[PDB]
Design a binder for this molecule. Sequence first.
Ligand SMILES: Nc1ncnc2c1ncn2[C@@H]1O[C@H](COP(=O)(O)OP(=O)(O)O)[C@@H](O)[C@H]1O
Ligand SMILES: Nc1ncnc2c1ncn2[C@@H]1O[C@H](COP(=O)(O)OP(=O)(O)O)[C@@H](O)[C@H]1O
Ligand SMILES: Nc1ncnc2c1ncn2[C@@H]1O[C@H](COP(=O)(O)OP(=O)(O)O)[C@@H](O)[C@H]1O
Ligand SMILES: Nc1ncnc2c1ncn2[C@@H]1O[C@H](COP(=O)(O)OP(=O)(O)O)[C@@H](O)[C@H]1O
Ligand SMILES: Nc1ncnc2c1ncn2[C@@H]1O[C@H](COP(=O)(O)OP(=O)(O)O)[C@@H](O)[C@H]1O
Ligand SMILES: [Mg+2]
Ligand SMILES: [Mg+2]
Ligand SMILES: [Mg+2]
Ligand SMILES: [Mg+2]
Ligand SMILES: [Mg+2]
Lengths: 370, 370, 370, 370, 370
Amino acid sequence: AALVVDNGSGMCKAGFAGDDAPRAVFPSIVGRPRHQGVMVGMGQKDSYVGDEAQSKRGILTLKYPIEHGIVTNWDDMEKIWHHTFYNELRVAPEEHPVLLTEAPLNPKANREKMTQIMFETFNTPAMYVAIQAVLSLYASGRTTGIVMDSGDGVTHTVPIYEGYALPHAILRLDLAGRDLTDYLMKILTERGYSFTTTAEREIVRDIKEKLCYVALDFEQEMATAASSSSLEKSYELPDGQVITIGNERFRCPEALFQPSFLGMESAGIHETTFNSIMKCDVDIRKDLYANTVLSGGTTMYPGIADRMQKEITALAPSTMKIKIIAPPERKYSVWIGGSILASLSTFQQMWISKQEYDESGPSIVHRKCF
Amino acid sequence: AALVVDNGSGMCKAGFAGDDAPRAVFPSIVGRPRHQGVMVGMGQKDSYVGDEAQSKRGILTLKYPIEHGIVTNWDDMEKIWHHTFYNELRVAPEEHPVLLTEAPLNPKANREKMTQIMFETFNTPAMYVAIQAVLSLYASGRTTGIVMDSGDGVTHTVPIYEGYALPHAILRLDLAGRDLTDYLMKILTERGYSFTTTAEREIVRDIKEKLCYVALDFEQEMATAASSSSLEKSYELPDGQVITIGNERFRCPEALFQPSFLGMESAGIHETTFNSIMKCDVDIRKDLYANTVLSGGTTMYPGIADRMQKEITALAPSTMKIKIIAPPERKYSVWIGGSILASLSTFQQMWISKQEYDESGPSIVHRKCF
Amino acid sequence: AALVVDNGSGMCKAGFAGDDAPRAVFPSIVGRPRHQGVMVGMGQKDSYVGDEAQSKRGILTLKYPIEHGIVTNWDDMEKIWHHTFYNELRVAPEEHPVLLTEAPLNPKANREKMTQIMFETFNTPAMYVAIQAVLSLYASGRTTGIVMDSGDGVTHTVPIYEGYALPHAILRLDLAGRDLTDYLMKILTERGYSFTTTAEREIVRDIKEKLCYVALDFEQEMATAASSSSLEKSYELPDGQVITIGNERFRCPEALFQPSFLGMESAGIHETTFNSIMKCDVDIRKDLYANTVLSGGTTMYPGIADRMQKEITALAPSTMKIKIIAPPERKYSVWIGGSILASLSTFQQMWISKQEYDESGPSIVHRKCF
Amino acid sequence: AALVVDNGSGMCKAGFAGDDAPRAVFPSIVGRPRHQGVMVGMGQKDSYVGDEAQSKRGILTLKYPIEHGIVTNWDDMEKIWHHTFYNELRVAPEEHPVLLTEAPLNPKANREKMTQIMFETFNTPAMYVAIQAVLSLYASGRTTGIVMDSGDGVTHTVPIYEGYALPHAILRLDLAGRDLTDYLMKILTERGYSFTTTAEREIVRDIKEKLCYVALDFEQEMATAASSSSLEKSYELPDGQVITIGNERFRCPEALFQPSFLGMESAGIHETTFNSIMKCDVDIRKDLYANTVLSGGTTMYPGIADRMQKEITALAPSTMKIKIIAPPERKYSVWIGGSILASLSTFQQMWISKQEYDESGPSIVHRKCF
Amino acid sequence: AALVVDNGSGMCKAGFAGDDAPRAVFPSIVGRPRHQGVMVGMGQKDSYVGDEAQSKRGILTLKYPIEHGIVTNWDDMEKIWHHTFYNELRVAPEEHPVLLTEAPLNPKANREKMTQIMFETFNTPAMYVAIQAVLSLYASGRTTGIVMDSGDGVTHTVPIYEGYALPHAILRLDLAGRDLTDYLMKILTERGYSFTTTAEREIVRDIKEKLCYVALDFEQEMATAASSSSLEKSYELPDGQVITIGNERFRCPEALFQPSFLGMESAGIHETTFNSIMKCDVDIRKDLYANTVLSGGTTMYPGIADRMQKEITALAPSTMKIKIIAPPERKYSVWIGGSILASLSTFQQMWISKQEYDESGPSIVHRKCF
Ligand SMILES: Nc1ncnc2c1ncn2[C@@H]1O[C@H](COP(=O)(O)OP(=O)(O)O)[C@@H](O)[C@H]1O
Ligand SMILES: Nc1ncnc2c1ncn2[C@@H]1O[C@H](COP(=O)(O)OP(=O)(O)O)[C@@H](O)[C@H]1O
Ligand SMILES: Nc1ncnc2c1ncn2[C@@H]1O[C@H](COP(=O)(O)OP(=O)(O)O)[C@@H](O)[C@H]1O
Ligand SMILES: Nc1ncnc2c1ncn2[C@@H]1O[C@H](COP(=O)(O)OP(=O)(O)O)[C@@H](O)[C@H]1O
Ligand SMILES: Nc1ncnc2c1ncn2[C@@H]1O[C@H](COP(=O)(O)OP(=O)(O)O)[C@@H](O)[C@H]1O
Ligand SMILES: [Mg+2]
Ligand SMILES: [Mg+2]
Ligand SMILES: [Mg+2]
Ligand SMILES: [Mg+2]
Ligand SMILES: [Mg+2]
C-alpha cells in the first residue's frame, strides 16, 4: 500500500492510499526547550515533534520547518517525516511508495531535496510529488474546474479543463493562514491582549479557528459591530483568563479579500481566482466559473463561500453562473485526492522508482512530476 | 447504397445516395492538445475530429487539413474520412461505392491521392470524383446554367449549356469563407476586440454567420451606419462578454465584391460570374443570364442574391433578363446533387471500379472523371 | 519647431524635430502612495510621473496607462503628456505642432482620443499620428524594407516597398517586453527569488536588460548551462542582496521565438516576420529579405539579430540573401524617424490643423493619418 | 502657545512648543505614605508626585501609573497631569492646546481616555496624540529613517520613508528600562546586595544610569572582567554604604541584545530593528540602513551605538552602509520633535478641537491621530 | 553511601542518602559562655553546638551562623558541620560524597565557600549544592509544580514544569520563621511578657510552634478573640511561670500574609506564590495552580494550607483548580528530596569531584550546580 503524506506549512496529514481520511494529522512543528532542566532522572528529550510539542509548548520554542510552502529547515523536516513514518503511521517507509505534495511555483531545489531525502534517508522504493490543487480536483470527482487551495503558507489557484492544466494561468499568493494568525495577534493589541511568544501564537490560531468568520458585506458588518455587542464572543485562555473580541472576528479573515490590511500590494483571493480564469482561453471560462473549488484549512471560515460567490459574481459577466464548490471535508481534499491518485492503476507507472533515481539523481523529479 | 461525401475546406457533409439531406455534417477540423495532461485515468485522446474538436477547442489547436480546396495534410484528411465512415455514418466503406467532390482547376495530385486512399486505405469497391459546381446544377433540376459555388476555401463558376460544360470559361477565385473570417478578425480590432487563436477564429466565424449581411449599396450603407446605431448588433461571447459591431456586419461580406479590401487584385464574385459568361459563346449567354445559380455556405449572406442581381444587371446588356437562383438549401446543393447523380441508373457505369484501379493506378481518375 | 513624442507602452521619448536624439526619455508610469503620510509640512504630491515615480517606487503603486499599445487610463495619460511638455521639454504645446506615434491595428478610438486631447486639452496648433514601424524606416534611410518593431507592449511588422506600405501584410503580436518581464518574474521563482510588487517588476525589468540574451541555438545553450556555471551571472538587488541566474538569461528572450513558453498559440517573431513577407507580392520579397530592419527596445538583446538571421534563413529559399539590419540606436529609431519626418518640407501639409479639427471632430485623424 | 507633554513610562517631560528643551522633567511616580503620622501640625499630604515623591521615598510606596506605555491607574495619571500643568509649567490648560505622545500598538482605550480626560477634566481647547518614534524623526530633521525608541516601558521601531510610515513594519518589544532595572536588582544579589522596596528600585535605577554600559563583544568583556578588577566600579548608597560591581555593569544592558537573560523569547533590539527593515519594501531598505535613529533614555548607555552598528552590520548585506544616528540629546528627541510639530503652520488643522470632541466622543482620536 | 546535609537558617538536618528520614536533627546554633567559670576541674568547653547549646542556654549567648539563608560566620559554620559529621552521624566525611542545599538567589560567594570548606577542610571525595525547593519536588514525587519553601530564614517559590525550572519566575522573601519569632516577642510585650535574651528567643520560638495557627479569616478571628476567651491558651515557662496568649496566636503567623505587620513593603506568601505563577508561560499556569507544594517548618502552622488555598483562589481565575499540597512530613521535604536525588543512578555524574575542584577552584560550583 502506498503512503500519502501531505506536508503543508502548518499541518502534516499522512495515511494510506485507498483510505478516505488521513490516519495521522498533527502540527508540522518542532519544539525545543528554552529553559534549563533541573529534574534528574526524568525523560527529557532534546526536541519534540507534533502533538508532543503542542502539549509541552509552555517550556518550548516552537519552529515551523516549512514557511510559505518552502522547507526552510531540512533537519527539522526530517524529524517530522521520521515522526510521521515511525511514530504516527508505524510503518517502514522502505516497503511503501510515498506520494508527497507541493505548492506550484516553488523553488526547484525544494522538491529535489524531497526526492533525495526520500530515497537516501528513508530508502523508499518509489516516490512522487504532486501539485496540491490538482489533488483537490481528484477529491471532488471532477476533471474541469479551478481550485483555490489555501492552507497555512500558500494560496494558489490552478485551472484545469478536461484534465489539462493551464500552467500560465496558475497564480500564487504568499498570503494564507499564518499571515492571518499574525494579523489577529496584531489587532488583538487594540483590546489590550498581548500575545508574543511562539506558544501564544498557537493560542491565537485556536482563537482564529473558533471565532473568526467572513462577513458578506464588510462595511455593513463594521457598522453592526460598532452599534451593539451582538457580534462579541468570549474565549477562555489556558490559564482561565477570558478575552472578548468583536469586529476582530471578521477583520482577520477580511485580509484574504483586502491584502492591504497586511501592507501587501497583491489582490485578494477573489480577484486572484478571477484573474486566473481570465488568463485561460475564452472557451473554457464558463466551465471554470461553474466549478470553482475551495480547498484547505484557510477556506474553512464560515461565510467564505458566499463571499467568494458574491465577489466573483461582481467581477464576471452577469450571464455567467458562478458556483463555488466548498465541500465540508475540504480541509483534507489534498490528502483525499492523493489517496485517490495513488490508488489508480493508471498511476502505477508514474512513480519515480529507486532505479530511475540512481541513474539520474534528484533532478529526475523535474522530468516525471508536474 | 452509394455514399456521397462532400469534403469542402470547412465542412464535411456525408450521407447516402437517394436521401435528400446529408446524414452527417461536421467541421473538417483536427484538434490536438496544446497543454499537458495532469489528470490520470481520464480518457484523453491524442487528437479530436469534427464536433468533438469543436467542443474541446479551448485546450486544442485546431487545424484544417484542406486549404483552398486542396488537401495540405493527408494524414489528418484520413482521420476525417475515418471519422466520417465509422463514427458518423457507421458503415463499412468496403461495401459502398463512394462519390467524392472537388473544386475545378485543382492540382492533379489532389484527386490522385483521393483515389489511392479510397482504394488502398478504405478498400472501397468503386469511387468517383465529381466537380462541385456541376453537382449544384443537378440539385436545381437544370441542364443549363452557370453555377457560382462559394464555400470556405474556393469560389468557382462553371457554365453549363444543355448538359455540356465550357471548361475554358471556368473561373476560380481563392477568395471564400475563410478569407472573410480572417478579414472580420482584422476589422474587429478597430473596436478593440482581439481574436487570435484558432479557437477564437471559430468564434468569429460564428459571429460572421449570425450578424453579417450583404449591403445592396455599400456606400449608402456606410453612411447609414455612420449616422445612427440602427445597424448595430450585439453578440455574447462564450465567457459572457458582449461585443457590439456596426458597419463590420456588411464590410466583411463586401470583400466578396471588392477583393481589394483583402489586398487582392482579383475581380469580385459578380465580375467573375460575368466574365465567365462572356467567355462562353454568344448564343448561350442569354440562357446563362437567366439561370445563375448560387451554391455554398458563403452564398448564405442575407442580401447577396439581390446584390448579385444588381451588379450583373449593371454589367450585362439592358435587354437581358438577369435571374439569380438562390434556393434556401443551397448550402447543401453540392451534396444533394451528388445524391441525385449517384442514384442515376445511367451513372452506374461511370464508377471507377477496383479492377480499373488495379490495372491503371491512381492516374485512372484523370481519364474517367471530369 | 515641431515636437516629436513617441509614446510607447513602457517609455516616453520626446524632443524637437530636427534633433538626432530625444531630449527627454522617462518611464511611462504614474505612481501613487499606498501608505499613509505621517510627516506634516513635507512636500508630498498626490501622484508621481516618470523618473520621480521610479525613484520613489518603494512607497508607490506603479501604473502604466498604456497596455499593449492601447491607452487604458486617459487621465493618467494626460499626466504623462503634461509632464512631457511642461517638466521635461519645458515648452508651451500651444506653440508647436506635435507628431505622435501609434502601433498599427490599434482601436480607432485610441487615436481619436489622442487627437481630441491634443487639440482641446493642450491646444496644439497642428497634430499628426504616425505608424511606429514606418518611422523606423525613415530613420534607416530606406524606402524599401520590412520593419519589425518590438517595444514594451506590441510587436508589429510593416513591409514597405518603394515607399508603399502593404497593409494586408501587416502583422501584430501582443507579445513584447512587458510579457518577457512577467515571464522572467515567473521563472525566477525556480531559484527561490520572489518578485511580486509593481516596484519589484521594475527591478526584474532591469535584470532583464542587463543579463538576458538570445541564444543562437536554444537546446545547445540549455545543455551548456546544465553542465557548468560558465553562463551564471550575479546581480545585486537595491537592498544589497545578490541573486544569481543561469539559463533564465536566455530562456526569457526565447519566449520571443517560442511564444508557447507563455501559453500563447501565436508564432514567434521570426515566423511573424516571414509570414508578413510571404503575404507580399512575390516580386518584392527578395528586397524585403535583404532589408529586414529591427526596431525597439525588445530588439536590444545581444544575439537577437544573429538568431533572427538564422531563423529566417531556415524559412526562406536558400537563394535569398537574408540581411538583418540592427542599428546600434534602434531603441530610438521610431523617434529619430519621426524627427526626420516632421522636418520634411513635403510633410508640412500633412499636419492636421486646428481648423480641420474644428470642422470635422476627432474623426479627422482617420482621413489624414495612415 | 501649545503645550507638549511627553508621558513615558518613567519620566514626564513637559514644556512649550517652540522651545528647544522641556521646561519640566520629573519622574512619573505617585508616592503614598506607608507608615502612620505621629507629628501633629505638620503639612503631611495624602500623596506626593514627581520630585517630591522621589525625595520623600524613604517613607513612601512609589507607584508608576504607566506600565509598558499603558496607563494602568487613571486616577494617579490625572495627579501627574495636574502636577504637570499647575505646579511645573504653572499654566491654565484650558488656554493651550496640548500635544501628547504614545507608543504604537497600544490599546485603543488608552488614547481614548487620554482624549476624554484632556477635554473633560482639564478643558483643553485642542488636543492631539502623536506616535513617539515619529516625533524623534522630526527632531533629527529627517523624513526618511527607522527610529528605535526605547524608554522605561516600551521599545519600538517605526520605519519612515519620504514621510510615509510603514505600519505593517512597526515592531514593539515590552522590554525596556524598567526591565533592565529589575534585572540589575536580581543580579546584584550575586554580590550580596539586597534591593527590594520601591524606594530601593530607584537607587538601582540610579546605579544603572551611572555605571552600566554596553560591551562591544560580550564574551570578550566577560573574560576581561573575570581576569582582573579593571572594570570594577564603586557606588555610594544614600546611607554611606559603598557597593562594588564588576561584570554587572555590562550584563544588565546586554539583556537588550539577549532577552533570554530575562526569560523572554523575543529578539534583541538589533534583530528587532533589522526585522523591521526587512518587512519594508526592498527599494527603501538602503535608506533605512543609513538612517537608523536611536531615541529614548534606554539608548543612553555608553557603547550602544557602536554595538548596534556592529550587530546590524552582521545581519545586513556587506554592501549596505549601516549608519547609527545617536544624537547627544536623544533622551529628549520625542519632546523636541513634538515641539517642532506643534509649531508647524501645516499642523494647526490637525488638532482635535473641542467641537469635534463634543460631536464625536473620545473615539474621534482614532480618525484624526495616527 | 552519600551524605545529605540540609543546612537551613534554623536547623541542621543530616543523614544518609537512601534513608527516608534524617538521622540527625539539631538547632544550627553555637553557644558561648557569657559568665565566668568558678568551678575548677569541671569539663567546661569553650563553645557548644546544637542540642548541647540548647540545654545549657541559660548561661550561654546563642548565635546562628546562618542568617536569611546566608552564612554570616564561617568559623561557626565549620563547628556545626564538624559536629554534624563526627558527633551526630559519626562518619568520616572523606569517605562519603556530600549533598548540600541552598536557597536560590543567594550570594555566589556563599556556595563557593561551601565548596572550598567541603574539599579543603573535610576532604570530601565529591560534593554538590542543590536548590532547596527543587528537592521538595523530588520528595513529592512530581516533575511539575510550584514549591513554596519557608524555613527559619528564607521564603522562596520555584516553579517547575516537566522537570524544567523557570528561573526568571523564582521569587524570594527574606521573611520567614525567625522574623515571626521576633514579631511574637514584640507583641508579647502587650500582655507584659518580656523576652529579650537569645535564650528567651528560643522559648518564644517554642511558644510559636505549639500555640500559633493561621486564621482562615483574620478580621473575623480578631472579633472572636475580642468577644470571649475561647481562643486563649496557656503555656508554662521553664521556671514554672504560666503565660496566657489570645489573638497573638494568629497575629504572629498573619505576618506571612500581611508583611506590613513587620514594617515590610513586600507581598505576602500567597501573593508571592501567585506572582511567581503569573511570571510563567500561560500554558503551564493551570498545572502550577493544581500542584502548589508547601515545604519547610514555617508551613507547619495549623490552617496555613486552607488559608493559602483561599487566598490564591481569590487571585486566580475562577475556572482554575487551586490545589495546595501540604504533606504531613513537609518539614523534612528538602532532606527527603535530597536523599532521593543523591540515590539516583543518573545523578552519579552530577557530583563535583575532587579532581574537578583541583583544576578549577571553588568557582566550579557555578558551572555544575543550578
Ligand atoms: N475552522 C477553521 N477556520 C479558519 N481557519 C482554519 C480552520 N481550520 C484550520 N484553519 C487554518 O488552516 C491553516 C492550515 O490549513 P491546512 O491546509 O489544513 O494545513 P496546511 O496549510 O499545513 O496544508 C492553519 O493556519 C489554520 O489556522
Ligand atoms: N449563414 C451563413 N452566412 C454566411 N456564411 C456562412 C453561413 N453558413 C456558412 N457560412 C460559411 O460557409 C463556409 C463553408 O461553407 P460550405 O460550402 O457549407 O462548406 P465547405 O466550404 O466546407 O464546402 C464557412 O466559411 C462558413 O463561415
Ligand atoms: N538592453 C535591453 N535589452 C533587452 N530589453 C530591453 C533593453 N532595453 C530596453 N528593453 C525593453 O524594451 C521595452 C521598451 O522598449 P522601447 O521600445 O524603448 O519603449 P516602448 O515600448 O515604450 O516604445 C521595455 O520592456 C524594456 O524592458
Ligand atoms: N544615562 C542613562 N543610561 C542608561 N539608562 C538611562 C540613562 N538615562 C535614563 N535611562 C533610562 O531610561 C528610562 C526612561 O527613559 P526616557 O525615555 O527618558 O523616559 P520614558 O521611558 O518615561 O519616556 C529609565 O528607565 C532610565 O533608567
Ligand atoms: N509546628 C510548627 N509551627 C510553626 N512553625 C514551626 C513549626 N516547626 C518549626 N517551625 C519553624 O520553622 C523554622 C525552621 O524550619 P525548617 O525549615 O525545619 O528549618 P530551616 O529553616 O533551618 O531549614 C523555625 O523558625 C521554626 O520556628
Ligand atoms: Mg495544505
Ligand atoms: Mg463546398
Ligand atoms: Mg516603442
Ligand atoms: Mg519615552
Ligand atoms: Mg530549610
